[PDB]
């Protein structure tokens, strides 16, 4: 009960790349930062397919637990961004 905004195109490059990837998986155009993946027509099978190309592209694991909990470009962009950053596992 918070995804009530109108379509808003991605404005940060990360968001912009994920929105493109969604268009290639869903076969539609106009993916926004607030577009709820499941509302667009996507489902679990599609969600797992997103993580497949993204894991190889962004070098990062995306479990369904994140995709389903936060089915939005904004969420994935931040979840991915914080992981792509320079960690210090040492």
Curated annotation (Swiss-Prot):
Modified residues (O-(pantetheine 4'-phosphoryl)serine): 44
Top-level taxon in the UniProt lineage: Bacteria
Carrier domain span: 9-82
Leader sequence segment: none
Functional description taken from the UniProt entry: Incorporates six amino acids (for tyrocidine A, Asn, Gln, Tyr, Val, Orn, and Leu) in their L-configuration into the peptide product.
Subunit architecture: Large multienzyme complex of TycA, TycB and TycC.
Protein family according to the UniProt entry: Belongs to the ATP-dependent AMP-binding enzyme family.
UniProt free text on domains: Consists of six modules, and harbors a putative thioesterase domain at its C-terminal end. Each module incorporates one amino acid into the peptide product and can be further subdivided into domains responsible for substrate adenylation, thiolation, condensation (not for the initiation module), and epimerization (optional), and N methylation (optional).
Additional information: Tyrocidine is a mixture of four cyclic decapeptides, tyrocidine A (D-Phe-Pro-Phe-D-Phe-Asn-Gln-Tyr-Val-Orn-Leu), B, C, and D, in which Phe, at positions 3, 4, and Tyr residues are gradually replaced by Trp, depending on the relative concentrations of these amino acids in the growth medium.
Protein name as annotated: Tyrocidine synthase 3
UniProt organism field: Brevibacillus parabrevis
Lineage of source species: Bacteria, Bacillati, Bacillota, Bacilli, Bacillales
Gene encoding the protein: tycC
């Amino acid at each position: 009960p918070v995804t009530e905004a109108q379509y808003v195109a991605p404005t940060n490059a990360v968001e912009s790349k994920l929105a493109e990837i969604w268009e290639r998986v869903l076969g539609v155009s106009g993916i926004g930062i607030l577009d709820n993946f499941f509302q667009i027509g996507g489902h679990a099978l599609k969600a797992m397919a997103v993580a497949a190309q993204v894991h190889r592209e962004y070098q990062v694991e995306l479990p369904l637990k994140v995709l389903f909990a936060q089915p939005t470009i904004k969420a994935l962009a931040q979840y991915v961004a914080t992981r792509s950053h320079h960690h210090h596992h040492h």
